[PDB]
Design a binder for these strands. Sequence first.
DNA 1: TGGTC
Length: 177
Amino acid sequence: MDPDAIKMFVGQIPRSWSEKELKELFEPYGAVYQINVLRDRSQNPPQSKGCCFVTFYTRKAALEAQNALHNIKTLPGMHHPIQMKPADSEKSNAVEDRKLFIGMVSKKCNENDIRVMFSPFGQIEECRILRGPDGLSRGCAFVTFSTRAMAQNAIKAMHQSQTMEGCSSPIVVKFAD
DNA sequence: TGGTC
Ligand SMILES: [Mg+2]
C-alpha cells in the first residue's frame, strides 16, 4: 500500500455480509489492500457489527470511494445509506494533545495578549480566556497550536517564565486536562 | 484564592 493510503471505516453494511461481498463493492473504485469486518464475539456465534474497514492501495482510490459512497449508496436491506470516513486508528495529531492550559494569567489579559505571547512558538488555531458565569476572567486561557511539537516548545520556553500583574505565582503552561 | 473547556 502507498505510504499515504487511508484506512476507511464503513458503516451501514448488512450484518449478513462478509469480506466477500465487500470486495465486490469496493474493488470497482480501486485496488483493495485489506478488508476487515468488525465483529462481536460476546456470545456464540460471533457476528458482524455491520461495519468494516477497507484500505485501498492508493489515497486517491480511498477518497473517490468515500466521495461516491458516503450518504449516497444504500446496500440491500438497509434503511440508511453507507457512512464512510477515515478510521479512528488513523488520527495522529488530536487537538486535545496540542492544547495548553495557561494559568496565572493577569485577570486583565485578553485573547490578543495571549496570542502575542505564544505566537512565537507556532500557528495558534484557537485562543480563549476562560470566564465564569459572572463574566469575570478566571485568570487562565486555553491555547491550541496546530501541532504538538509547537505546544511542547511553548511549555519549555514559557512555563513559569514570568509572573504577570496581580498573580501570586509565575505563569503556568501545561498540556490541558 | 492555584483558575482546566
Ligand atoms: Mg476561585
